[PDB]
Design an enzyme around this catalytic site. Structure first.
Site, PDB file in Angstrom:
ATOM      1  N   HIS A   1     104.996  78.753  78.027  1.00 52.69           N
ATOM      2  CA  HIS A   1     104.648  78.178  76.741  1.00 52.69           C
ATOM      3  C   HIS A   1     103.127  78.098  76.640  1.00 52.69           C
ATOM      4  O   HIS A   1     102.506  77.335  77.386  1.00 52.69           O
ATOM      5  CB  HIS A   1     105.285  76.805  76.557  1.00 52.69           C
TER       6      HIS A   1
ATOM      7  N   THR B   1      88.493 113.732  34.355  1.00 50.18           N
ATOM      8  CA  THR B   1      89.784 113.063  34.188  1.00 50.18           C
ATOM      9  C   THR B   1      90.857 114.037  34.574  1.00 50.18           C
ATOM     10  O   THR B   1      90.824 115.235  34.233  1.00 50.18           O
ATOM     11  CB  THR B   1      89.975 112.537  32.740  1.00 50.18           C
TER      12      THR B   1
END
EC number: 4.3.2.2
Lengths: 423, 423, 423, 423
Positions: free
Chosen positions: D67, D139
């Protein structure tokens, strides 16, 4: 991360292992040229004897070179003297890089496949151990009908065997290298060299490559890894539900501990690692649309995903094997949990039996509902209410009534199902 | 969405088609019982003659019932009179639901597979048409070495054939239904009924099911669909690059239009649809970890993903077939683009030739670099500078020099590669 | 999908509502030019009186035009006579498209935000109703320490109040349109026309746009939407767990039903819808990197995501509101579940008391562990075992023992926490 | 991974830095108890003088403890003698863990934010340097209309200034810790201790926590991080396109190199790192729905994501800053690329001029289309064709023609747009 790197898998992904794969590729290529009569006899053996993996040297050269495989090629150059004429001859860097990653992913796939087969054996053993252990089947988290705990484990076994076959196909998908030079058309290195060099590595030639092995193969492999992990996630969530305090049917292995504080920590960890495994799928899929004959955007992704996906899954499979191998299974608690609703699990059987004996669907339904209701709101059992119901008393015998509570009904076809997995 | 629903695929996903699949399942199940001698002879034929698909009736009953398959079962009940005793007998709703979705996904898989095979035929045709068309190979968006435009298309062909085999396996994965009742253990419906009923539908029994067909099969199918889409995305991005104004090598089909305003609109759309296809993979993977013997969280996901993933991919395959079938390919512009850097494409050949003739790697490199530099900053060609370089003039003949600019060098192995796909 | 389209959100996403937003944009733009003196007085009112939304006309024109906004501009053109000179003047298509999607996403955001605030009011009410209802807190699915059920609902309230604020910022982020023409530099339409036109619509000008409003704004919005959904998903998973047979603390609203068959179907549905909401985040994030001054790959993604993400979240908020408003809360069961482990929930208080009274951490722990064990494996309570433990008997009084089993220790600060939300 | 760990960010994520944050939390908590009179005066300074970060000790204790924070608490315990009574007093592990991760994520956010502001300053500088540099707007990858290169860089500047604000809110969101004990209700540690302890750390108290800080805060933070990354990805894809051989407008910094082989390798790397950053978003979003008062599934995910997401973004910001700072900008090439299509970029101005002078939209369009076509298929310019067109000759003067080819039409509002960013 280091938390779950486990041997054999983590030995695959060191810098040494990588440079050794690059040398392996380079040696297969000089061997192929030499066996074809294209470079003098003896070159490969001498490069094999003199080429050493020296990580610090390659990294020092890379400081100046700013290019990982060029630094390697020069580092090896400085050990092999005149033979450097024939080393890395005609190759582009991605011939070495991508062939070396096929080697790594095929080997990682094999480590993963062996541990997966081993998970299947443990699941088969645990399913046969509890083959006839009664447990309550649960839909929407709600008691439904009795079933066996071995049959639940068999469903997991069934899923992991589908993943063994999936893992075999993913290994096949990634078993392709390239020794085809700058834009993949053998202008600088003959395709006969490629075919010989890759057969010595246990790999096949990408039938048409560009500068790179096409990245749809890697995305396929990694999508398969994420699906294996989500099955382990299904198992892990089951055990979390079954170890909760109101259920207590199963307990994952641990470590004398407090009996009421046994937390399903490993299976929670497994669930989180499955989230990471499926996280790697998306980046692998938009690695696919490389520009023209390649761009290098995939390289940085793959530095995370190849080592992390294969080491996390390996850790998932080994850990979940241990969880299923050693988990405690509380058979009496399983059996006791069937009676939690005090017979109301058998309420469909009772409903149908009243239609059989004349009544209409709605008629029967109201008799069961009223008994259910009384059972639910008290401490007496469903059966004890049914027996005292007058409308029930004129339609059904008491021995008829009691036999509707036999668990063996739910259980008559368990062997039929197990038999589908035998032989 | 309706933008790309195309016939046959969109006819699969209407409410009528769904209810017809549920009836198909129900009829296979009564047939199986009747062929086993478990319900009287004649039941199936009579239910077949009297059961009508009436969408408004089922939806009206569902307003009261709040449950889609129960409303269906009652709607059909009201047409079939006494035979309703034997209809939906022992089944759970997900026997019908999940078997019906196998039917739909197998059929969707077959529509997808036929259109994919057709994309492969067009790609094979276009690759053989431009088999020997010279074009410049590009790495990192930068001119690298000459190659052929048919070989680039072949790489796409190669990828879509790997996807035909992947799609066949995904169809196999989803070819499993269940007729196993509430928690999958045949308590209420014998497994012999399941086996007969699913063989009439062309499906196989899930070897062990719970209340539901396990969702790893669906996640596998959908992961395969996302990978097919990302290959179409690779093609679509290539054409966007090749139709840009500074490149003009390829033009996607359109509709007299302005010659300078031809926008790669279809391929941009394809790229966006691939983003949606890979978006469905993640939700399908966490559909896998259903709780116990099922929860219904996957149902709402699948209402989006089954119809949208299979209709989007179908639209992607048909559209990209048309784009590749009819795109204009500007072969002279391809060939002209090889000379954009005025010979500097052949600069490695020139470098190596100076090492061959005595010089060291660095020595050669500096001669090429200086010529490159002059070429790059002016209007004369690399070759014209090399010829006038004195250091070059004493090491290399002029006929030697000029033959290093032959495009056929880059091209000697194109047939070798195409031959891997023949026969 | 249609399953969860609910008024007013679904009225936003029809074809009619879309063309109305296009006209609204067009009229703001003519109004802006007219107020600046750039087109004759009266144009805007006339175009307003004449310009009708005729979906079938626009779709018929689009069949020939192959362009959605061009078809619209022409259809409006056929109704507005001579004023068509002044209509759509200098605009690029994405001035109308992206400004119209800001209108939609702002208004969608507002509908979402009002239903969210309403979900907060219901949560506050339910939390205050159970402010002091004892319940067992659970970690890793395991009984931990007592808490209040109103406190749990408060945490959900706290999460949705964080989402109200997050939703207000997401609305702000998407409140930008553009009226700046082909590449966003006002070559064809003045920036003062943009400023006036967008303030009439309640929007702000993108400070620099390209052909398009930058797609990071939409990705931020959809990311916030997926966060709100997952908080709904946390709530729905709690109610699934609490409605399981072994727990029975809460029951989602439904529809007399069988008492044992109450399934948390709405909550499982909410779980699955949360998975779709997070699935839309990834496609939105890669819409961000458009090529140069735009490509149109995002358009197809946004036809799915804008309508689907806003309608699914709207459905989730309204449905979760009804769930929490009307769910049954079993307080006696919650209180009874605290004693499931027969006092062992207070075992840390007992442990610490033994250290207080002299013992070392390990000493104390072994006494508690032994009693825990005996309690766990029998029917007698922890307290009854502690009282009879001789080592305990010489360190702790009985009244000192019993008062470690007071629940009010765990609840003393409930009232401090609710206070933070007041005022 | 180690590839991009850069100081100061990587110093945040060592084991040492983690244990230091744990101690910092522990010391704030003892300080808070001591200032409230709850533990003796002097405890905190003593624990401060004695408590040493000893990574190997904590890892050795963890081998036995299994732990991480328990091992830490004991290791510190062995150094601080009698004051260990007062250390970690009433805390649950996640009081330390989650408070320590708020410290880390706040400080990471701050390092990220300062490098981001610095990226904005470089962007502003580069944009102002090319304020008036003409370039062709593009574009769909196709020449559209002239614009300025500084304007393009401004849009990137605008995007990163939106990210600075987004990063400040994400820092705010993660500025919450907890010192509230096992289920977050202050049963074991007072709320006034939490308030004091967190204000010493610069943090605020979660207003209601469970065992854990709610994971929607971390998901919001990581979502903002993925948005910042994709804006870097937009920039890096522009530079890839602009550095392609056919374009040559920009060249990323490098390292004398071959002039034709300059590859946009850093930008392709940035693209791939953006894919990892968005991959971490999904795992963070499903960490949100923890079961009850917590499960620990999120812990394992956060060991990858916290360190990897903050270090990868930090690397991306610093590297993109150097790219934009040092990239070469070819202004004459940008200006030259405007004339690639030989005047056809001005074709809409020509079209509209013909409608001005009487013609109808279709009439005008056909004249422009024919001249466009002739220009496209030859070497003469659009203007030269218009001048010789008789239909054009009778509607437009030559000086009226030529002035439609003025670039300053496209640039008149550059200066209005930069002005919005000033002051």
């Amino acid at each position: 991360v280091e938390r779950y790197s486990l041997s054999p898998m983590k030995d695959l992904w060191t810098e040494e292992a990588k440079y050794r794969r690059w040398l392996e590729v380079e040696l297969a290529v000089t061997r192929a040229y030499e066996e074809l009569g294209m470079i003098p006899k003896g070159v490969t053996e001498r490069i094999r004897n003199n080429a050493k993996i020296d990580v610090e040297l390659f990294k020092k050269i890379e400081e100046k070179t700013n290019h990982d495989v060029v630094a390697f090629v020069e580092g090896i150059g400085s050990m092999i003297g005149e033979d450097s004429r024939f080393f890395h001859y005609g190759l582009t860097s991605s011939d070495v890089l991508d062939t070396a990653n096929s080697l790594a992913l095929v080997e990682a796939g094999k480590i993963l496949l062996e541990s997966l087969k081993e998970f299947c054996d443990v699941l088969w053993e645990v399913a046969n151990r509890y083959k006839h252990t009664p447990t309550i089947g649960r839909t929407h988290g709600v008691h439904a009908e009795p079933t066996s705990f071995g049959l639940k484990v068999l469903g997991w076994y069934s899923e992991m065997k589908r993943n063994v076959q999936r893992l075999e196909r993913a290994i096949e998908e990634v078993s392709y290298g390239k020794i085809s030079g700058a834009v993949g058309n053998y202008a600088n290195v003959p395709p006969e060299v490629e075919e010989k060099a890759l057969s010595y590595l246990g790999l096949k030639p990408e039938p048409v490559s560009t500068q790179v092995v096409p990245r749809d193969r890697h995305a396929f492999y990694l999508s398969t890894l994420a699906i294996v992990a989500a099955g382990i996630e299904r198992i892990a969530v089951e055990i979390r539900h079954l170890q909760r305090t109101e259920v207590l049917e199963v307990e994952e292995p641990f470590r004398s501990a407090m009996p009421h504080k046994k937390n399903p920590i490993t299976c929670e960890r497994l669930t989180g690692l499955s989230r990471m495994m499926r996280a790697y799928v998306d980046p692998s899929l938009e690695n696919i649309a490389l520009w023209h004959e390649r761009d290098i955007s995939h390289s940085s992704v793959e530095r995370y995903v190849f080592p992390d996906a294969t080491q996390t899954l390996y850790y998932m499979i080994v850990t979940a094997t241990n969880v299923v191998r050693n988990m405690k299974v509380n058979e009496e608690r399983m059996k006791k949990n069937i009676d939690l609703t005090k017979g109301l699990v058998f309420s469909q059987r009772v409903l149908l039996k009243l239609i059989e004996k004349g009544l209409t669907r709605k008629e029967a339904y109201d008799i069961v509902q009223r008994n259910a209701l009384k059972t639910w709101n008290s401490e007496k059992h469903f059966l004890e209410y049914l027996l005292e119901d007058e409308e029930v008393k004129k339609l059904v015998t008491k021995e008829e009534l009691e036999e509707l509570f036999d668990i063996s009904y739910y259980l008559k076809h368990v062997d039929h199902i197990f038999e589908r997995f035998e032989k």
